[PDB]
């Protein structure tokens, strides 16, 4: 089926400037109390989650150096440490990852 | 390319038109434009109004304070010697004062004679109106007074123009008798009163009170507001006709949206009958006694 006549510009403006085709304004945006960037309220902060992601990657790299190959994964729990730290009695008997950076402010000792 | 001058030139005209449409040029004196002879202009003014002026007196009448002070700015900034010939200019102050005084007197007499029942406050209001900034500027600018006037700031702010108009009146009062000038005033001022109301120019805010006072003066007692005609009271657009009665005779009547508005109207109407400012009233006399 082929259009019988050209649609006029008035008609077409009516179709595409219609309220329903307009981008709708998001009212759930707020500021992250931590870094002061923007985030939606139901979603993690992009920025902070990036810090966490980088650190996670580094930890995983260095716990890839402790595993000589693909299929060796520890049969014990592991704990991650930073400059100027020592394994507690509760935390000994576990795989130890030693990282160079000082322990990050958001990351607690646990 | 197309070979010819013609279309190119003709288009240069369009270019200029658009240029003038998007940026309008600030208004320029008729004197600073290409065809001007000040003298011939002045003579033509006089002839076209069917009046006879002393050219000295008129040329004087179109001179203003501001033009002289600006001329002294140009005199003092270039180091020129003007003072004798420039301060010989004899401004229009005097002429304008005689003009306004005489015009107010004249007008006042005209009205006082035509409307015997107009209170003094009223006739004052009227003369005030026909001598107003608005009216006089309108008439002056339509007689090419703004054209001839010598002033700084070309749009020639309204006080300067009132000054200049009545300057011309005074110049006429010297040039010819009070009779001639009375005719000129009744022709170019009183005619602005055509079509106008009373309370259009009077502006009084409490018609009822004024009516009661005027009826005390006439020895009639108590106008009683009595509702005459009405349509819809419950509507968003009611109409009331309130009559005003004095000893059960009906003196005057008026329409309105609200009974209050209408009562006030009946007051204005009554007033207008008493004062003889009316629609049916004899139109003004323009004649040669």
């Amino acid at each position: 089926a082929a259009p019988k006549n050209r649609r006029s510009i008035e008609v077409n403006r009516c179709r595409r400037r219609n309220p329903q085709k307009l981008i709708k304004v998001k009212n759930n945006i707020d500021v992250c109390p931590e870094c002061g960037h923007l985030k939606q309220k139901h979603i993690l902060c992009g920025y902070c989650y990036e810090k966490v992601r980088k650190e996670t990657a580094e930890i995983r790299r260095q716990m890839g150096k402790q595993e000589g190959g693909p299929f060796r994964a520890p049969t014990t729990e592991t704990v991650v440490l930073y400059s100027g730290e020592t394994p507690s009695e509760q935390d000994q008997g576990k795989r130890i990852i030693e990282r160079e950076r000082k322990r990050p402010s958001w990351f607690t000792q646990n | 390319a197309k070979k010819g001058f013609r279309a190119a030139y003709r288009f240069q005209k369009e270019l200029e038109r658009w240029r003038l449409l998007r940026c309008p040029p600030p208004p320029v004196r008729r004197s600073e434009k290409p065809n001007w002879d000040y003298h011939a202009e002045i003579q033509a003014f006089g002839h076209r109004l069917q009046e006879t002026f002393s050219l000295d007196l008129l040329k004087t009448a179109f001179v203003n304070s501001c033009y002289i002070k600006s001329e002294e700015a140009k005199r003092q900034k270039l180091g020129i010697d003007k003072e004798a010939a420039l301060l010989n200019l004899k401004d229009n102050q005097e002429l304008s004062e005689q003009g306004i005084s005489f015009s107010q007197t004249c007008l006042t007499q005209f009205f006082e004679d035509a409307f015997p029942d107009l209170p003094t406050e009223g006739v004052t209001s009227l003369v005030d109106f026909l001598t107003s900034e608005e009216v006089v500027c309108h008439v002056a600018r339509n007689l090419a007074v703004e054209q001839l006037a010598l002033s700084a700031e070309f749009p020639v702010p309204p006080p300067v123009l009132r000054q200049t108009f009545f300057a011309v009146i005074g110049a006429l009062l010297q040039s010819s008798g009070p009779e001639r000038t009375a005719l000129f005033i009744r022709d170019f001022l009183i005619t602005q009163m055509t079509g106008k109301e009373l309370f259009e120019m009077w502006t009084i805010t409490n018609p009822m009170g004024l009516l009661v006072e005027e009826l005390k003066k006439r020895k009639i007692s108590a106008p009683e507001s009595r509702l005459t005609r009405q349509s819809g009271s419950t509507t968003a657009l009611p109409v009331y006709f309130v009559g005003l009665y004095c000893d059960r005779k009906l003196i005057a009547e008026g329409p309105g949206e609200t009974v209050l508005v209408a009562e006030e109207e009946a007051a204005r109407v009554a007033l207008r009958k008493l004062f003889g400012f009316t629609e049916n009233r004899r139109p003004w006399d323009y004649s040669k006694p």
Binding site: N27, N28, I29, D30 | -
Partner: protein
């Protein structure tokens, strides 16, 4: 002013959420058991039965279905309708509604306060019931 969206929970601490829940549920129990005694409060005058009369109805909750048998041997299937919390809410007189019969507005089962609207919550507030679905 760009005023942001908000829900009931948003600003409460982990401490105050159980508290608010307790608050609401407890006042629901109170309110429901208070109107539990209709006849001793201020009952509207009871009238005898006229021939062309019609009763109020109910708002029930479809449970499931069940078989049931009759003494003649036949099998039937039946629908269980449980009445949960059912109250008459307002009364519109005969001349204000159909000009023929009066109207009683009946509520269904109880729902949460937080997800209704200011208007409706006001309507129940002045009543003293919890909101009906």
């Amino acid at each position: 002013h760009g005023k942001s969206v908000t829900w009931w929970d948003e600003h409460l601490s982990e401490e105050n959420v159980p508290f608010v829940k307790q608050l609401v549920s407890d006042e629901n129990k109170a309110q429901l058991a208070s109107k539990l005694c209709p006849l001793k409060d201020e009952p509207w005058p009871i009238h005898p039965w006229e021939p062309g009369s019609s009763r109020v109805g109910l708002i029930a909750l479809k449970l499931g279905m069940m078989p049931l048998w009759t003494k003649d041997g036949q099998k039937h299937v039946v629908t269980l309708l449980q009445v949960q919390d059912c109250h008459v809410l307002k009364y519109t007189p005969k001349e204000n509604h159909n000009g023929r019969m009066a109207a009683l507005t009946v509520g269904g089962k109880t729902v949460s306060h937080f997800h209704k609207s200011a208007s409706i919550l006001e309507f129940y507030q002045e009543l003293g019931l919890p909101p009906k679905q």
